[PDB]
Symmetry: T
Subunit: 150 residues, 12 copies
């Protein structure tokens, strides 16, 4: 697996993720609704920007980003489920935290990979994104009454 | 079809549409690249906001929006295709104009539908969206050297 | 009943309502105090502006808005009660949602009435207000762990 | 008359009207000069925008807007007279109020017309403009010490 | 009388007063309509904020603010009258100046009282409010062609 | 021709010119549509401001500005034609550049005239406007692939 | 008389003038109070800036600006009188207009003088200031129901 | 104690207090994490500013503020404890409320002290700070479901 | 002396003081020119606003402010001298510090006076001004290498 | 070493910004307005790169070139007088070429500073290269070409 | 020493350092007082932000930041001394520059350590902070007339 | 003529902005922060003068110099490499000197364009000179000197 395949894989991942953030944003209920609803708006913007930047980096290294929902589903390792049963706020936030941890570890693989391949720019980009992702994992786990690595 | 089903269909449509806008945004080449590149960012934001407002309206009337790429693919009438053969700027803009016209005509059907069901709010929302889509159809058709309805 | 009497009635209702928003704003306690306190400031501004526009529209059609607390009490259908026994955040929010539902249904009546008398402008105004009120009913009921319209 | 002809007619009307607004802006005298001078600047921008939006709407439905002073004079029903003998602030404001009432009633006819032809977007646009015109008529008639419908 | 009762009394007074400002804002006519209309918006905001700070200060000292129109009418010393006969701009402004003078003198009483009970914070708050009210009395009486305190 | 009549003549010119800018704005088609569409918006604001400043200067020197479309048509040397046969983007831009060169030359005569009459203020004003016009001629001729003085 | 003496004379003049503007600002009474009071704030700032720029220009040409009230009184041709008798709004505005006309004519002498002396920078500065002064003379005379040169 | 010693003591207190605010900011967990996390950012800035202003006031009256952590620990009466065992949101907020009450009462003593020594400026400064502290105590006690003085 | 006479004396003082600030602003030379030049602009604005607020307070309590340079010269205790012999930056700053100390001590006398006359508003106003002056005395004395009270 | 490289890039970046102005002044064609404003943007961005590089060189104890003579004597970027405007595609080709030169030279600087343990200068150059790569994609797309083409 | 302990040690360092910046801010005297006073304000904000970011990073990797002055004193290697004997501006700046060089070198060890442990995020963060610190050392040493590495 | 003058000032202004950067990078002393930011301000202002002059030259049918070589060959402003930082007073003396040179040359351009009937270029140069005179007063005051001294 090389840099282009990793960035394209993350394009698929991030599209599935922003749709998931919309799902939480729309279906959440409970006493933390206002704060976590606005917060999901913030996350949607942030990872939409991550997605645009990953696609633009892929383009800049001569790659071709996935650009259809078909390709995003076919290639993403992030998972999604239709919202049938009502979920508690904690359950939605655990789904979010799980996806954030997936994206963190996959980005770690991308950082190591781009280091071996000598792609310093992509490396730096992935590191910055991971920094934000770690911050979120800490904050949302704090919401869940848990330690970041718990 | 009723109002809830129509709005949900438009949620699917707009997700497919915004990803299509991203496709044009990433893969376009030619002398108009900078202008239409920024223009695609603007359209992405605008129809992202349309989708947000449609989903929020569907929520406010007791509906349940589609919230996965699987559901969007299963329900959208907007057509997507992976970017394989290279396309000219005029060709990408013709795809954009085509989907805008589809959304226009479906929005007209939704306006008549909601006006028949007595949902005044959704009616007004759809009319505002159509106002904007008609403007975009005029402008992009002008870019293509054509009259709006031609 | 005609358009003028309806708008004036809503002047009375909206004054009683903004004062109610102040009651909730001042007397609320519980873990969501900070978020819901700011939220009540927002609602006070929003419905203060709704009240200003209803009065200005009433003036523009040749009407005379109620302009004293006495007239407001005499004509408003929104009910107010002095704050004697402590209420929980959920009790205050249920009162708020109740008044929002009252305003939604009465605004629906005004939309139908103004559409019957051929007052297009007042109709459009009430429809925009109802759009926002429906949004609020969804969000606050979501705060209460309930579906909108439930 | 149909929708296209009506919109074009209002383009001519709005050009004659904005020029009249400039006339009052330039020639007014009296103790309310500073307030009403700035106010005329505001109206000039607002009705310049109405004109731009009416023309863009006309373009979007396949029409061809008038685009010369000759066509405006030949087609406008708004009436203009060169400033000759000095006029009082109340006289100029009466001219403005009269033209505003002309535009109000003609917009009423257009709202009915677009409602008959099923042009929902143009109907909504004209309704918004009429809301603003009604507000202005109330305020300027108040300036003249008169009721909005007096 | 003590500090809590005074602040609550001013809650009632300021609610009756802001509604009065709305009455003047809506019903005014004459050559100064535009300037005094905007000015009334400013006063409504300013004394709305004074009312919010008086209530928040009352809460902060362990008091319970009046929070209904009924309590406001029952306890406020500011007098309100329904708008039946037309009033001139000068009559409305004289009513406004009168209520400002009432508030000035009562605030003077509260400054002396709170200085007597050792409530430094409430004293400082009332003194700032009186500073502004005195400024308003000067300016509006100047509008009336009169000296302040005359 | 003296200074007052020169400024009034330019009031007419600038009114016919801004309407022409609107014509180009509305009827343009082709690949440069978006950039030149916004650019025409900018030019309309700028030359509207020049016109307002010219009229205010005419007022300040004891003049009486033209304030009707009839006066503008009778006195303007700028040429207008209703948009009948379709024109290319280069043709509309060549019309615009032509009118700009007309305004440049007439302003040159106004600068010489005002220097002759000792009108330092109007001289300075016309020089500033001419600076702007010269820049516009350079940029639009560069757009047309032409030298500024070509 | 040379450039330095003229600029220093205008430093004295402008200081006396800004104090006069404060006088009008403080002592004015009448129905135009709010507009003309704020307007005097605007004028105070504008001519304070003229004064700073004249002094900085004098410094830049090797001169030494007056910098005491003593020097301002001893050198200014603008006149001032203590406010003893109450004046009407029109009387204050006539005093202002008179001072503006004095400053206009003296600036005209400075423009001619700096032209003969070849001081283009000071010339341009004085011309810009005069442009504003003419605009004010027109506007304030319009307030007085008079033509600018009347 | 005199004014200088009191102000220096409050410098030490405010440094210990801001560090405590950071402690709560970092270690909080629970469903209100996002709101109270931002809230702690706000308090950290506000009380950082109180500290800066207290120190600058101390400098202005000829005192010498503590300027090392050692002096802060040796002189502060605010008490700090390292975060060891996990604490609930209510436990941390109780610590904050307690420290706020300590600062409130000590500020009361300082207001009396500066009032005795005739230090009007420091008296006023401490009164403003106490107003803010009283507001915070009301709000945070409301968060804990308690009355401000309970 | 009473409150009105004191405030009027301070109007005279502050006019002389702001002109002195302008003198330092124009004539200063040395390595600190840029910093102290901007600093003088800031002080000019600040004490200009002090003078505005003092005059407005004098108006609000029924007084009549001095409004000519003649009256300011006749009544101010602040000393001005024409700039003849060149002065160093330290010397100009010592003049500034001297006048700031004069205003401080006179403001202390006014604070005691107004507190004795029971004018709480003017008392608070003067205390705020003294707070700022004490800060400035600290900073400029620090610039001069001195302790505040030295 | 690192100092020699950064100073070289000061010269390169001064020649480059002057060239950006050259394109800004001499461009003609239907894309004039968009690319004219675009050249303003590029001039700001690489003006800032140049300032930031010089500040880094100073921060590590170096002395930046600060005269046009030193820039000409040291820069590897190439400039040519325009008599003459050239087509828009020609100017964009020149710009893309200089961008690729700066990209590759910056890559050499990243490797150099990595070997020398200058983490800060390494990070700075990586950030600049990220932007330069984006520009190469966009201007190459303008020219109807793939990025690495 | 590992990454968690390194970051915590830097939390202590940055707290002692910001308090030191406050010391310099408060006690500085001399001709450069104003510029360096504001500059110390800026440094305090910047290094406060570095400290907050370091603690948030420590939290994100499963660490527990020091959160008391006692922990800061016991763990910080940055040196502080109470301000007793007066110091010159160059002495305070030399203390500041010294602490900056300490932080630069300790951050260099943290960069090497984090590179060793594979902590790409913390590595990148420390590099950004070190970039800023290197710039500050250059600028402050230039202020002291010294070379950066001198 | 006017075109020759404006193009000469393009060269002058490019040499000047590079010199402003030179002062910005090499200054040391107690006034470092104020004059460092001040040099940022001057670089922006004369950068804009340079752009505006070039745009005027284009607007009158000229072709601006657009390479460092042309700037060196045509500019009357003088530059010297700094090895070497120099005192703050020395850098400010150099700056004031270039400002006076630009002032006098701009005066010649005002007279020239006045004789040639180019009112626009005349007004532009007069505005620039106004600013340059203000700067000469302020920097001369910084040096403890009278403006025309």
């Amino acid at each position: 697996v090389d840099t282009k395949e990793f960035l394209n894989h993350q394009v698929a991942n991030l599209n599935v993720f922003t749709v998931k953030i919309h799902q939480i944003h729309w279906y959440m209920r409970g006493h933390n609704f206002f704060t976590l609803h606005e917060k999901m708006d913030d996350l949607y913007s942030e990872f939409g920007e991550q997605m645009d930047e990953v696609a633009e980096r892929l383009l800049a290294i001569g790659g071709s980003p996935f650009s259809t929902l078909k390709e995003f589903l076919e290639n993403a390792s992030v998972e999604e489920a239709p919202y049938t049963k009502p979920k508690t706020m904690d359950q939605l936030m655990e789904d979010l935290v799980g996806t954030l941890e997936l994206l963190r570890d996959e980005y770690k693989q991308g950082i190591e990979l781009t280091d071996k391949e000598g792609d310093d720019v992509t490396n730096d980009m992935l590191i910055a994104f991971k920094a934000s992702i770690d911050k979120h994992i800490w904050m949302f786990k704090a919401f869940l009454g848990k330690a970041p690595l718990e």
